[PDB]
Amino acid sequence: KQYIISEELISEGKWVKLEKTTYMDPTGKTRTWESVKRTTRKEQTADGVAVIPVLQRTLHYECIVLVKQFRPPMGGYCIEFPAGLIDDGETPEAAALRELEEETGYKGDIAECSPAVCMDPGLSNCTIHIVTVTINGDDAENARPKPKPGDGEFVEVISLPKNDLLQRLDALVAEEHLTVDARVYSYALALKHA
């Protein structure tokens, strides 16, 4: 029984905007909230995709393919699933395969696509689809993968074994100032907890 009453623009950049949200609380009292949105969302069912890329190779343990890059908002390097915004008219699956090839060089196969899931719902309306993709690392096309990074894109690939992901992430965090993404960490914790 809660709902939005109004959304007032506070400040609008090229990429991000701040809004004052008025909503009805369950007691029937009007309250406000400071909300972040992207300016880039048209008809996409989500802002972006994140890819869970499972690298599969005969007589190898499965690896989870990750990317390391400088994130200006963090003032530092972050370890994340490959990810990007969905272009206008692009499907989440095409966006996922495209961003995975651009960021890692690998050509994946779709396994499954989540519904739109929320990035930080107390702060922002941002959403992604989480797209699971398998990579046949025995295919010649996946032998010597070269990232195809766009303008102002500078991405390092880190493939870690699924069977040891949390400890391998911990070893990278111990050896440097970097930040692991919360989704990557959540995924690694569940692999341990299973």
Ligand X SMILES: O=c1[nH]cnc2ccc(F)cc12
Residues forming the annotated binding site for Mg(2+)?
A: 83, 99, 103, 153
- Pick the binder of ligand X from 3, 15, 75, 140 (CB under 6 A): 15
Angle made by CA atoms 15, 49, 178, in degrees to the nearest 5:
80
Residue whose tokens read 């396994």? 111
| Closest to ligand X by CB, 28 or 122 | 122
- Pick the binder of its own copies from 16, 94, 110, 158 (CB under 8 A): 16
- Pick the binder of ligand X from 4, 8, 10, 33 (CB under 6 A): 33
| Closest to Mg ion by CB, 76 or 150 | 150
Question: Within positions 129 to 168, which residues make up the interface with Mg ion, using CB under 5 A?
Answer: 150
**Alpha carbon of 193 to those of 113, 170, 186: distances in Å?**
23, 16, 10
The answer to the question of residue 84 lying near Mg ion (CB under 5 A) is yes
- Pick the binder of its own copies from 49, 52, 63, 65 (CB under 8 A): 52
CB of 139 to its own copies, least distance (A): 21
Burial 27-44 (b: 16+ CB within 10 A, else e): eeeeeeeebebbeebeeb
Q: Which two tokens stand for residue 194?
A: 């299973």
The answer to the question of residue 123 lying near ligand X (CB under 6 A) is yes
Cβ–Cβ contacts within 10 Å for residue 103, how many? 27
The answer to the question of residue 20 lying near its own copies (CB under 8 A) is yes
Q: Distance (Å, rounded) from C-alpha 70 to C-alpha 85?
A: 17
**Alpha carbon of 150 to those of 67, 123, 146: distances in Å?**
15, 28, 13
Which stretches within 34-131 are classed as H helix? Answer: 92-104
Q: Which two tokens stand for residue 184?
A: 């990557």
Which among Mg ion, ligand X, its own copies, none contacts residue 156 (Cβ within 5 to 8 A by kind)?
none
Q: Mask of contacts with its own copies, 75-114, x by CB under 8 A?
A: x-xx-x--x----------------------------x-x
| Closest to Mg ion by CB, 84 or 105 | 84
